[PDB]
Design a protein around this nucleic acid. Structure first.
Ligand SMILES: [Mg+2]
Ligand SMILES: [Mg+2]
Ligand SMILES: [Mg+2]
Ligand SMILES: [Mg+2]
Ligand SMILES: [Mg+2]
Ligand SMILES: [Mg+2]
Ligand SMILES: [Mg+2]
Ligand SMILES: [Mg+2]
Ligand SMILES: [Mg+2]
Ligand SMILES: [Mg+2]
Ligand SMILES: [Mg+2]
Ligand SMILES: [Mg+2]
Ligand SMILES: [Mg+2]
Ligand SMILES: [Mg+2]
Length: 154
RNA sequence: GAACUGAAGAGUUUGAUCAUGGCUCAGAUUGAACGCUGGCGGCAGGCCUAACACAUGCAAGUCGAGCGGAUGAAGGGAGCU
């Protein structure tokens, strides 16, 4: 898909005999607004080159999510590193109640009512890791219902 | 047929990084006070401190169909005029 969003641009440095060498890191998310989504990281010596590399990396390794009509299936709670993430479905009139990496990830993924919240560190890359770990494990019915028939598991 | 349906983060320790951890900010509220400024109306509110000391007015009276008593009009008039 093609929906580009830029999350964070940071400037890092390494020390050499002579002084400091600077570089730029960029984090981006891509998706089609209907279930495909992925993130990418890039590094370069200029901001546009890093952004381009991040877009190219993010356009690969895109995954498919299972969403129940512009909203999640069930309340979920994921984590990565020291970051914890909580999301839960909301009514249609609700917006996206989230901040930073949450908002970009969920808006690009195609959901509109997510009402999320994060605990622990708010490092954007770890937050994105945690959010995709949570979203990639959305089961949806007819798959958790592989044990037996349908309309009895619910 | 309703009586509820709802949760955002950021800055700052390093040459740079992740974590831990404190400090600070973005919101809503006052019986508020102070500074600058000030057209109108509706509805409310107005000694949070000294249960400190109080000048002067008013804030608890009524019943003569319970009872003596004294003030006893209007008049009937009479008398002298
Ligand atoms: Mg050497
Ligand atoms: Mg480098
Ligand atoms: Mg954790
Ligand atoms: Mg842990
Ligand atoms: Mg913390
Ligand atoms: Mg902090
Ligand atoms: Mg510095
Ligand atoms: Mg003042
Ligand atoms: Mg004044
Ligand atoms: Mg003034
Ligand atoms: Mg008082
Ligand atoms: Mg006083
Ligand atoms: Mg009186
Ligand atoms: Mg009586």
């Amino acid at each position: 898909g093609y929906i580009e969003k830029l999350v964070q641009v940071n400037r890092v440095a390494k020390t050499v005999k002579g002084g400091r060498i600077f570089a730029f890191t960029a984090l981006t998310v891509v998706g089609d607004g209907k279930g495909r989504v992925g993130f990418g990281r890039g590094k370069a010596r200029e901001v546009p080159a890093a952004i381009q590399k991040a877009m190219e990396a993010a356009r690969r390794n895109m995954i498919q999510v299972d969403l129940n009509g512009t909203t999640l299936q069930y309340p979920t709670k994921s984590a990565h590193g020291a970051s914890k993430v909580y999301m839960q479905p909301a009514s249609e009139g609700t917006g996206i109640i989230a901040g930073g990496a949450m908002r970009a990830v969920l808006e690009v993924a195609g959901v509109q009512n997510v009402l999320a919240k994060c605990y622990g560190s708010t490092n954007p890359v770890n937050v994105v890791y945690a959010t995709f770990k949570g979203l990639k494990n959305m089961q949806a019915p007819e798959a958790v219902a592989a044990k037996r028939g349908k309309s009895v598991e619910e």
